[PDB]
Structure formats: C-alpha cells, structure tokens
C-alpha cells in the first residue's frame, strides 16, 4: 500500500532495481494532526485498489514490472533504448511522453481484450 514509494528515484536502472527491492489543550494538536495522517494512509490504500483494478484490466495485476504485447508506434518519442536507461530520470518521461499515455492505455485495453477471446477459441 504505497502512495509515495519514493526512495529518491533519480537514475532509471537504479530506479527499476530499488523498486523491486524497497516496495516488495495539547490533545488538540495531536488529534487534528493524527486524523490528517490517517487520511493520508486510507487514501493511499484506496489509490492502490483503484490502480490494481486498472492493471487487472490490462492483465498486469499484482506484478510490479510487467511486460506486454504492444510495440511502439513511430510518433512515441523514438530515442535509442540503450541511452534511455543510461541518462534519464523517470520524471523526464512524462515530459517526454505527453499525449501518448492516453492511447497507450487504450491499446493495452484491447491487447488483453482480444487475447481473452483468442484463448477462448
């Protein structure tokens, strides 16, 4: 149940590896600011359960790293895939892919959805 899972992620090969490793009176001051730290956690649980239904529709529920059968298009920021893991932060992706993340999420819908009927036959 993570909402942060930060661990100061900068370099992507260190970000991918550590991701598998890490996330595997005076009573008025402390009761108001204790409920605020329960609304942090209880939302960060319901953000997980909303997210693991979205990966479950794509087929990647539970697995942190998952691989899937949708290749790149040409207009999806064609840089070399060896330097992409060398010198880039994970923050620089959402700058680099702007409007493609909505159609990637749509193509990963139909890649599972056609597969559910393919193994049905």
């Amino acid at each position: 149940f993570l909402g942060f899972l930060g661990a100061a992620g900068s370099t992507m090969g260190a970000a991918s590896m550590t991701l598998t490793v890490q996330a595997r009176q005076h009573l008025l001051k402390l009761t108001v600011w204790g409920i605020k730290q329960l609304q942090a956690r209880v939302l960060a649980v319901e953000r997980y359960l909303r997210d693991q239904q979205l990966l479950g529709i794509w087929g990647c529920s539970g697995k942190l790293i998952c691989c899937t059968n949708v290749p790149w298009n040409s207009s999806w920021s064609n840089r070399n895939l060896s330097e992409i893991w060398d010198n880039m932060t994970w923050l620089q992706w959402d700058k680099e892919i702007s409007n493609y993340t909505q159609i990637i999420y749509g193509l990963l819908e139909e890649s599972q959805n056609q597969q559910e009927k393919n193994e049905q036959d």
Partner: peptide, 30 residues
C-alpha cells in the same frame, strides 16, 4: 453608464490588527 455605487452600511468597532504567521499545507494525496 449602467453602473451604480451601492452604499452598504454596517457596524464598525475598533479592532486590534497585527498578523500572525500562517503555514500553507497540502491535503492527503499531495
């Protein structure tokens, strides 16, 4: 010239007015 200056009257006592520091915090999820 479709504008008109509406006068609004109310009580008006004398107050003390010094500001205290105020910390802006973010809600859960931010």
């Amino acid at each position: 010239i479709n504008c008109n200056t509406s006068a609004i009257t109310q009580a008006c006592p004398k107050v003390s007015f010094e500001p205290i520091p105020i910390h802006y915090c973010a809600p859960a999820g931010f």
